[PDB]
Design a binder for this molecule. Structure first.
Ligand SMILES: *[B@@]1([O])O[C][C]([C][O])O1
Length: 261
């Protein structure tokens, strides 16, 4: 299609490897580019950890209000919110929000611990029908994004389907789904990524990711004004370990997708 030709051209111009999956929930049509290739998730994996904790809260009704102590040893490489609460506590809701809206890595590690390790996050993916997602490591090493390494990867197709189920479907209870959507819509890290390629009037909830090898990711639910929502996953990684982030590629891919509608 026109869109696949434009995405291939964008990829060629960028020097890296681009993966895209769009689900249009109007007709459940899909647009895929490298849709079944594995990409390092980096921080887009935080959506799965937060959703797994939300799923737990369907039975443990007060779980999100449980205080979790932030100790100095807990701090890793990027902890914008957790740093503000060292030697104090954050609730699981606050940690989930921090992981999602600020990409706080300490928050992610506390969520992983709550789930019993990376295998607990992966188990939740399996439980909602995602056979592709795998979380193997904690922060910060899950961002190494080594070419060919299957650890901490998923495919665009799988992540788009899972994000659809979590936000628009019923993998979560009604209050939990609404909470997740609220958290994603409040993301603070996404302005230069998918959002930048879309009409300013569209509502977007997204989670970015970045890692080594210039890995630059964003996964989004998009609510166009007067139109069924869309789920868009854009993964990008580069051949040089020290490559710079390329959020503009994700913006451009979103723009190309949006043109085709
Ligand atoms: B994710 O990818 O988003 C930011 C943090 C930095 O390590 O991880």
């Amino acid at each position: 299609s026109a869109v696949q030709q434009k995405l291939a051209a964008l990829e060629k111009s960028s020097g890296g490897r681009l993966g895209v999956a769009l689900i249009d929930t109007a007709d459940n049509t899909q647009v895929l580019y490298r849709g079944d290739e594995r990409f390092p998730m980096c921080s887009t994996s935080k959506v799965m950890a937060a959703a797994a904790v939300l799923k737990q809260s369907e039975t443990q009704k007060q779980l999100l209000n449980q205080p979790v102590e932030i100790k100095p040893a807990d701090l890793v490489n990027y902890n914008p919110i957790a740093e503000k609460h060292v030697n104090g506590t954050m609730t699981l809701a606050e940690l989930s929000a921090a992981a999602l809206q600020y990409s706080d890595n300490t928050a992610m590690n506390k969520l992983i611990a709550q789930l019993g390790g990376p295998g607990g996050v992966t188990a939740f993916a399996r439980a909602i029908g995602d056979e592709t997602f795998r979380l193997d490591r904690t922060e910060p090493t899950l961002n190494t994004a080594i070419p060919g390494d299957p650890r901490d990867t998923t495919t665009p197709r799988a992540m788009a389907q899972t994000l659809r189920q979590l936000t628009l479907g019923h993998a979560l209870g009604e209050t939990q789904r609404a909470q997740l959507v609220t958290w994603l819509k409040g993301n603070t890290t996404g302005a230069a990524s998918i959002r930048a390629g879309l009409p300013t009037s569209w509502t977007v909830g997204d989670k970015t990711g970045s890692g080594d090898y210039g890995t630059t990711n964003d996964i989004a639910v998009i609510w166009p004004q007067g139109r069924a929502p869309l789920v868009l996953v854009t993964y990008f990684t580069q051949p040089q370990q020290n490559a710079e982030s390329r959020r503009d590629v994700l913006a451009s891919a979103a723009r190309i997708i949006a043109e085709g509608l």
